[PDB]
Design an enzyme around this catalytic site. Structure first.
Site, mmCIF file in Angstrom:
data_model
loop_
_atom_site.group_PDB
_atom_site.id
_atom_site.type_symbol
_atom_site.label_atom_id
_atom_site.label_comp_id
_atom_site.label_asym_id
_atom_site.label_seq_id
_atom_site.Cartn_x
_atom_site.Cartn_y
_atom_site.Cartn_z
ATOM 1 C CE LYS A 47 13.009 13.529 15.879
ATOM 2 N NZ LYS A 47 14.469 13.649 16.059
ATOM 3 C CG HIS A 62 -1.755 1.167 1.339
ATOM 4 N ND1 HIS A 62 -1.304 2.393 1.767
ATOM 5 C CD2 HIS A 62 -3.038 1.325 0.947
ATOM 6 C CE1 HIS A 62 -2.291 3.259 1.641
ATOM 7 N NE2 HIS A 62 -3.357 2.635 1.157
ATOM 8 C CD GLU A 68 13.213 18.026 9.520
ATOM 9 O OE1 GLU A 68 12.632 17.259 10.326
ATOM 10 O OE2 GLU A 68 12.570 18.529 8.542
ATOM 11 C CD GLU A 98 7.700 13.039 8.002
ATOM 12 O OE1 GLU A 98 7.249 11.897 7.899
ATOM 13 O OE2 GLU A 98 7.491 13.736 9.024
ATOM 14 C CG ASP A 150 4.447 12.467 17.584
ATOM 15 O OD1 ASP A 150 3.596 12.851 18.395
ATOM 16 O OD2 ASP A 150 4.818 13.095 16.566
ATOM 17 C CG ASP A 207 -0.736 6.373 2.743
ATOM 18 O OD1 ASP A 207 -0.223 7.304 2.091
ATOM 19 O OD2 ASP A 207 -1.983 6.310 3.015
ATOM 20 C CE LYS A 208 1.112 0.855 7.996
ATOM 21 N NZ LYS A 208 2.347 1.460 8.559
ATOM 22 C CG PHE A 254 -6.770 -2.661 -7.053
ATOM 23 C CD1 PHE A 254 -5.740 -1.786 -7.295
ATOM 24 C CD2 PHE A 254 -7.041 -3.017 -5.740
ATOM 25 C CE1 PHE A 254 -4.984 -1.279 -6.241
ATOM 26 C CE2 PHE A 254 -6.297 -2.537 -4.697
ATOM 27 C CZ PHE A 254 -5.260 -1.670 -4.942
ATOM 28 C CE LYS A 288 -7.290 1.320 2.004
ATOM 29 N NZ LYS A 288 -7.856 2.659 1.733
ATOM 30 C CE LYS A 306 7.226 11.531 13.575
ATOM 31 N NZ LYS A 306 6.045 11.989 14.312
ATOM 32 C CG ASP A 352 -3.775 6.615 -3.105
ATOM 33 O OD1 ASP A 352 -4.133 7.802 -3.207
ATOM 34 O OD2 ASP A 352 -3.832 5.969 -2.038
ATOM 35 C CB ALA A 353 0.286 10.397 -3.693
ATOM 36 N NE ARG A 388 -2.892 11.122 4.617
ATOM 37 C CZ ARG A 388 -3.009 11.750 3.471
ATOM 38 N NH1 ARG A 388 -2.286 12.792 3.200
ATOM 39 N NH2 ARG A 388 -3.910 11.383 2.607
ATOM 40 C CE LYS A 389 -4.008 3.732 4.677
ATOM 41 N NZ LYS A 389 -4.096 5.145 4.406
HETATM 42 C C1 LIG Z 1 -8.842 4.446 -3.537
HETATM 43 S S1 LIG Z 1 -7.201 5.167 -3.368
HETATM 44 C C2 LIG Z 1 -7.602 6.910 -2.729
HETATM 45 C C3 LIG Z 1 -8.321 7.732 -3.797
HETATM 46 C C4 LIG Z 1 -7.377 8.046 -4.980
HETATM 47 N N1 LIG Z 1 -6.346 8.920 -4.510
HETATM 48 C C5 LIG Z 1 -8.105 8.781 -6.131
HETATM 49 O O1 LIG Z 1 -7.420 9.505 -6.875
HETATM 50 O O2 LIG Z 1 -9.345 8.621 -6.228
HETATM 51 C C6 LIG Z 1 -6.686 4.550 -1.806
HETATM 52 C C7 LIG Z 1 -6.106 3.138 -1.805
HETATM 53 O O3 LIG Z 1 -7.063 2.229 -2.376
HETATM 54 C C8 LIG Z 1 -6.382 1.212 -3.096
HETATM 55 N N2 LIG Z 1 -6.752 1.297 -4.498
HETATM 56 C C9 LIG Z 1 -6.117 1.903 -5.546
HETATM 57 N N3 LIG Z 1 -6.684 1.698 -6.718
HETATM 58 C C10 LIG Z 1 -7.756 0.885 -6.398
HETATM 59 C C11 LIG Z 1 -8.718 0.233 -7.215
HETATM 60 N N4 LIG Z 1 -8.774 0.355 -8.540
HETATM 61 N N5 LIG Z 1 -9.635 -0.533 -6.591
HETATM 62 C C12 LIG Z 1 -9.591 -0.634 -5.262
HETATM 63 N N6 LIG Z 1 -8.735 -0.077 -4.409
HETATM 64 C C13 LIG Z 1 -7.842 0.654 -5.055
HETATM 65 C C14 LIG Z 1 -4.886 1.415 -2.872
HETATM 66 O O4 LIG Z 1 -4.519 0.676 -1.712
HETATM 67 C C15 LIG Z 1 -4.830 2.917 -2.613
HETATM 68 O O5 LIG Z 1 -3.657 3.275 -1.883
HETATM 69 C C1 LIG Z 2 9.617 19.771 17.108
HETATM 70 S S1 LIG Z 2 9.299 19.605 15.344
HETATM 71 C C2 LIG Z 2 9.366 17.721 15.109
HETATM 72 C C3 LIG Z 2 10.779 17.192 15.339
HETATM 73 C C4 LIG Z 2 11.738 17.676 14.228
HETATM 74 N N1 LIG Z 2 11.339 17.067 12.996
HETATM 75 C C5 LIG Z 2 13.202 17.250 14.492
HETATM 76 O O1 LIG Z 2 13.951 17.127 13.506
HETATM 77 O O2 LIG Z 2 13.536 17.030 15.680
HETATM 78 C C6 LIG Z 2 7.546 19.703 15.274
HETATM 79 C C7 LIG Z 2 6.956 21.110 15.286
HETATM 80 O O3 LIG Z 2 7.418 21.811 16.453
HETATM 81 C C8 LIG Z 2 7.590 23.187 16.144
HETATM 82 N N2 LIG Z 2 8.992 23.535 16.303
HETATM 83 C C9 LIG Z 2 9.995 23.616 15.377
HETATM 84 N N3 LIG Z 2 11.140 24.063 15.852
HETATM 85 C C10 LIG Z 2 10.844 24.303 17.182
HETATM 86 C C11 LIG Z 2 11.614 24.875 18.228
HETATM 87 N N4 LIG Z 2 12.882 25.260 18.093
HETATM 88 N N5 LIG Z 2 11.017 25.005 19.430
HETATM 89 C C12 LIG Z 2 9.757 24.595 19.569
HETATM 90 N N6 LIG Z 2 8.947 24.058 18.659
HETATM 91 C C13 LIG Z 2 9.559 23.958 17.491
HETATM 92 C C14 LIG Z 2 7.093 23.402 14.718
HETATM 93 O O4 LIG Z 2 5.705 23.714 14.788
HETATM 94 C C15 LIG Z 2 7.321 22.020 14.116
HETATM 95 O O5 LIG Z 2 6.485 21.804 12.979
HETATM 96 CL CL LIG Z 3 -5.515 4.789 1.507
#
Ligand SMILES: C[S@@+](CC[C@H](N)C(=O)[O-])C[C@H]1O[C@@H](n2cnc3c(N)ncnc32)[C@H](O)[C@@H]1O
Ligand SMILES: C[S@@+](CC[C@H](N)C(=O)[O-])C[C@H]1O[C@@H](n2cnc3c(N)ncnc32)[C@H](O)[C@@H]1O
Ligand SMILES: [Cl-]
Ligand SMILES: Cc1cc(=O)n2nc(-c3ccccc3)c(-c3ccccc3)c2[nH]1
Ligand SMILES: Cc1cc(=O)n2nc(-c3ccccc3)c(-c3ccccc3)c2[nH]1
Ligand SMILES: [Cl-]
Lengths: 380, 380
Positions: free
Chosen positions: A274, A14, A55, A42, A276, A16-17, A235, A166, A270, A243-244, A249-250
């Site tokens: 972090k 998938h 970063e 990312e 999170d 995102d995965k 499919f 999915k 991360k 699909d990007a 995102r999951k």
């Molecule tokens: C349906 S797409 C999200 C909508 C898409 N971005 C669009 O442009 O409409 C989300 C996920 O569904 C699955 N997908 C992609 N094409 C598909 C298809 N033809 N039938 C069913 N699922 C699909 C993939 O896992 C994809 O990442």
């Molecule tokens: C702390 S950053 C996530 C960790 C970061 N990606 C890293 O490389 O450690 C998440 C959010 O915190 C805020 N942020 C960025 N720099 C910061 C700083 N110096 N002090 C506090 N918050 C900060 C911004 O809103 C940023 O989008």
């Molecule tokens: Cl999806």
């Protein structure tokens, strides 16, 4: 007294995965050389492209081209006919050092146990006694359906399968004094990318007989269960081409499938500073320890942090009425038994170890006896 | 009987939120010319870069350079000294048509009311009577703190402020028969990007006196309230330069701040056929209608879908014990009063209208009397 609940999961291919797995492959590659690497990687995926953005401050020397392409190879995207090929895709890198302003406020010149949280935020942990692994049945089944597809793809018995999939499972539950008891499976969805030659009937028959029946106990399936198998009808285009994909995102697939709660943060890409990730893992560990310790049948734990501050700002427990002890008493037990500073979580959960790519498909929880899945013996 | 709960929010220049706003600026630009545009626009932001990635099939002619740069200008990133400048950043576009396989399975040759869901997934709606707007106080206050920062930045009274901010509010609550009653604010965090010349003490004093006191009623603040104001000590580097941003990475800020539940889907950049957005908006509308109609004090609604299928696969209601009616009876009322097919939601909630950029900061719910915030009169 019954209700329906639905959860979903997705496969290794998938889009995102894919991104989560690549982000964690990058994290692991750094940690193999520098256990203290600061990583915030990312990944973005679209037709022909993996982009790394974020970063990283690390002493490691990492070959991003190799790490990305090997992750994609493992997933199974190895040919233009499948829509994506690790050998020939574009890998673009937009990686900078960690902001020095973050670094100075979080970890520079700080004793490790007293490192600050790497960000503010809130995180939840959840556990339910409805399965041995203390996870919701809806999401366990959804994950296992995706894993079964990948198994049958990799062993060649359904060679028309491709990596992008999915699944979605709706279970009918009964309430039980705040705990929940699965009764039956109400509806299953499976969508999976496939080759141009296989027909819908062959696919639907295989998905029922070789996937669902190999995963879901028959006692949960009956004449009323609804099956939506290849419901879009076609499919062939899939993966990033269809699909990007983006890291993070999951986050509900990664956690509890809609049960419990979520604070919004993504896990993959991360390092342990972090919160999170590390504090969500610790909160899972707390929740599972309360259930396995017999204090609750079902529990939700919230924590929260401020950037640069080690101790959590808040800790909260909700037991759904499934403990004889008050939530206040459980909170005292948690505070006595756990230290949720990130610089202590890292030691308890071994969070410098490069095991993260293994977490990045099929959920982070309920599998594999990771440290956060091994309950702590509680003293009280 | 009291407990703590924490929610966060972020400002308009937070890098993830920049991406959500750009994605929705793109969606609105398409909808202004083609109300039936199929849009799935992800945005990625890092130093000097906005990348658009995803799938759009539309009759519109959209100048992506102009749409992106005007969104960034509105946010306030207009100079290299602030870390990002709409005039001079790179805008890269990796946009393709919608997959024809998706199109044929979802909407091609289908009556609009009977269009299929654009994906599988699960979605939740939530409402709580603790505020007039039926939102959790924790997140309302967190949003308003970010809005206050932007106000004081834009009116020039704190000219050292920059657009990137985060806030976090912890409230002590009392339980009340399944409803929740705010008592006091336990902790506030504010972090905001700032210029190189202002000192920490000037900032902390302003954040307390001109931001917090201008937003949070004094009755909630006392000698015990904890303030973490600029807790990292220094936040000069910010925006995408400090931290990569992606669309759909603030989904809890966008919704209920950890309360209720989330199905995982992002809102921004998506037209009405993507039920991640439309069905979450409809579920909010249902939940708010149940509370404003006096049937509940607090309620959570789940729905779910299969790609290509119009009607939801499941609908579930949880009232936390705050209704005299059973959850079964409430579900019957919902089924009688609402039609949650996407091709009907679009008509009820006017989801072809280009109002989406307005939703993409400060939460999608509890503000501005959008259609999903206007309760439906229920018949039962
Ligand atoms: C349906 S797409 C999200 C909508 C898409 N971005 C669009 O442009 O409409 C989300 C996920 O569904 C699955 N997908 C992609 N094409 C598909 C298809 N033809 N039938 C069913 N699922 C699909 C993939 O896992 C994809 O990442
Ligand atoms: C702390 S950053 C996530 C960790 C970061 N990606 C890293 O490389 O450690 C998440 C959010 O915190 C805020 N942020 C960025 N720099 C910061 C700083 N110096 N002090 C506090 N918050 C900060 C911004 O809103 C940023 O989008
Ligand atoms: Cl999806
Ligand atoms: C009768 C009953 C007892 C109970 O303890 N719960 N818990 C939850 C729940 C809460 C947050 C996240 C996920 C599930 C629900 C529920 C059921 C259907 C739809 C929505 C929520 C529920 N319904
Ligand atoms: C005593 C009591 C009654 C009650 O109805 N609730 N609901 C929730 C809740 C459930 C899902 C999402 C967000 C809040 C909680 C709770 C409190 C602290 C931490 C975690 C959950 C709770 N605690
Ligand atoms: Cl963030």
């Amino acid at each position: 007294g019954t209700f329906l609940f639905t959860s979903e999961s997705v496969g290794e291919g998938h889009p995102d995965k894919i991104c989560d797995q690549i982000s964690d492959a990058v994290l692991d590659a750094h940690l193999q050389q520098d256990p203290d690497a600061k990583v915030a990687c990312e990944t973005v995926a679209k037709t022909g492209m993996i982009l790394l953005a974020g970063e990283i401050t690390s002493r490691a020397a990492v070959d991003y081209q190799k790490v990305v392409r090997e992750a994609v190879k493992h997933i199974g995207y190895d040919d233009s006919s499948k829509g994506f090929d690790y050998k020939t895709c574009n890998v673009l890198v937009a990686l900078e050092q960690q902001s020095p302003d973050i670094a100075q406020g979080v970890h520079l010149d700080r004793n490790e146990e007293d490192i600050g949280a790497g960000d503010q935020g809130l995180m939840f942990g959840y556990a339910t006694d409805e399965t041995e692994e203390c996870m919701p049945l809806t999401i366990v089944l959804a994950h296992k359906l995706n894993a079964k597809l990948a198994e049958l793809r990799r062993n060649g018995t359904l060679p028309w399968l491709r990596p992008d999939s999915k699944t979605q499972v709706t279970v009918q539950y009964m309430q039980d004094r705040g705990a929940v008891l699965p009764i039956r499976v109400h509806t299953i969805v499976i969508s999976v990318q496939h080759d141009e030659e296989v027909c819908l009937d062959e696919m639907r028959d295989a998905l029922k007989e070789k996937v669902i029946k190999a995963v879901v106990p028959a006692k949960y399936l009956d004449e009323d269960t609804i099956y939506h198998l290849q419901p879009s009808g076609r499919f062939v285009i899939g993966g990033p081409q269809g699909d990007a994909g983006l890291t993070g995102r999951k986050i509900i697939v990664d956690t509890y499938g809609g049960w419990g709660a979520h604070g919004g943060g993504a896990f993959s890409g991360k390092d342990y500073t972090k919160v999170d990730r590390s504090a969500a893992y610790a909160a899972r560990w707390v929740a599972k320890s309360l259930v396995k310790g017999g204090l609750c049948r079902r529990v939700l734990v919230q924590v929260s942090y401020a950037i640069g501050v080690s101790h959590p700002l808040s800790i909260s427990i909700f037991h759904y009425g499934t403990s004889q002890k008050s939530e206040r008493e459980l909170l005292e037990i948690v505070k006595k038994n756990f230290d949720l500073r990130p610089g202590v979580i890292v030691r308890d959960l071994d969070l410098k170890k490069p095991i993260y790519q293994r977490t990045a498909a099929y959920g982070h929880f309920g599998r594999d006896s990771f440290p956060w899945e091994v309950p702590k013996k509680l003293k009280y």
